[PDB]
Amino acid sequence: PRPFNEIPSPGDNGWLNLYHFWRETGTHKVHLHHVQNFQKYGPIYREKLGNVESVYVIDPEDVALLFKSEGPNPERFLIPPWVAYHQYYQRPIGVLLKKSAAWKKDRVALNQEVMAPEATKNFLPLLDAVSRDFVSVLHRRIKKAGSGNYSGDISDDLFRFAFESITNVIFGERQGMLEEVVNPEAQRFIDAIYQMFHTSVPMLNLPPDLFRLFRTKTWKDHVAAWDVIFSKADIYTQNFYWELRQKGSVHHDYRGILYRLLGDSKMSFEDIKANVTEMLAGGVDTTSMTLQWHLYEMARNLKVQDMLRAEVLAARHQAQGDMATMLQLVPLLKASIKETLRLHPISVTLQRYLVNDLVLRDYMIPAKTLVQVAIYALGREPTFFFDPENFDPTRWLSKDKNITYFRNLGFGWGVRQCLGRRIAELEMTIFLINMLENFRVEIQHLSDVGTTFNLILMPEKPISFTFWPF
């Protein structure tokens, strides 16, 4: 068993490695940097960037070993500007920034309301209401254009849609972000979320001591974005708490996640408020970017779009209109979501700190090492996916249960996988059902759209769609 130091590497000087990364590839192209590194070093390597050293893997077979050796309270890589902000400005932390027993207590309480089938069934009509209103926005814009047609960049509208959805399931109340005249303070919350992510990038790979010294402007902007996030989330939670006491009525109808947690959970109010903040912020940029990519791949692959429409129409008929029943009759659509995340992951990597020593590819990796799975590079790798550039949803329906082995990694894995996974899957599946029933989607002057790293991975340039009523 080969020692750690023999794992291929650019070298042990983290600051020099950072220098070469910035010069040759650039901060906003870390995903390409991973691709290039596997081509240079093979299927496993180590790289110290600034202060942080990691081992990087790409093989699903190595991924399987990593996750099998996982302990009861897994830890991923913590974003240092996020940590520094919460510590310095003394903001209560939620499940994202907690560890061990304190993380477990939050997670178990939250899973009961946001992950469990018994809870999630209640999300359906709340998410369906928002998606139906999105459809109406588009029909209205089509009428106004006068051409039987609507063309536009809808990224801003997708951010608003994602915000309506997450707020509706949390608060059981519509915020009005899909109306013609919008709440400017809710729009300020949406913009801050984007800014928090974008401003995170120049501070990555640096200790907090170096942030304020060499990234002072960025840090200041980053602090301001988090302050907006916390101000507004706290106001929402505070108002809800008091209005609940003003209306003091037991409800038989479902009122949302916050009502459930305030009404009956082991969580303190302060843990609840901290987690509400993280759920709201997690709810905005991820599902909206993923949906945008999905529409892009449907416009790029019109045969696949047709197949998906036909399955949705059959499912609506078969279910006699019931959404709950429909969602079990659209396997190809759910596959196309897996396929969208394969090509366009939100998260460049998954990461785990090892609890015990571990052997990967005949190399000994000591306990406490950070191991990263390169999700983006895996998805483009022709040895792990047949024709990786092809958008092919049936790939996930293959009875060859080897082709999909540890491939579906967009939401992570295990007990500390994405907390919003069910919300996101349901929101996106329900959105696409309504869209496919109502419109055909095209891109005029279609061209390949690249990816940029803004903490989350994002389209590198605007995408302008054309929608035809179907």
Partner: peptide, 27 residues
């Protein structure tokens, strides 16, 4: 059963269930 019966892991291995299985469930 680490996630404790909420379909949020796969430690109880004895569409959503199908995906947890690729990476029957006891809960």
């Amino acid at each position: 059963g680490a996630c404790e019966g909420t379909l949020a892991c796969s430690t109880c291995h004895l569409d959503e269930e199908n995906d947890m299985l690729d990476l029957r469930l006891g809960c």
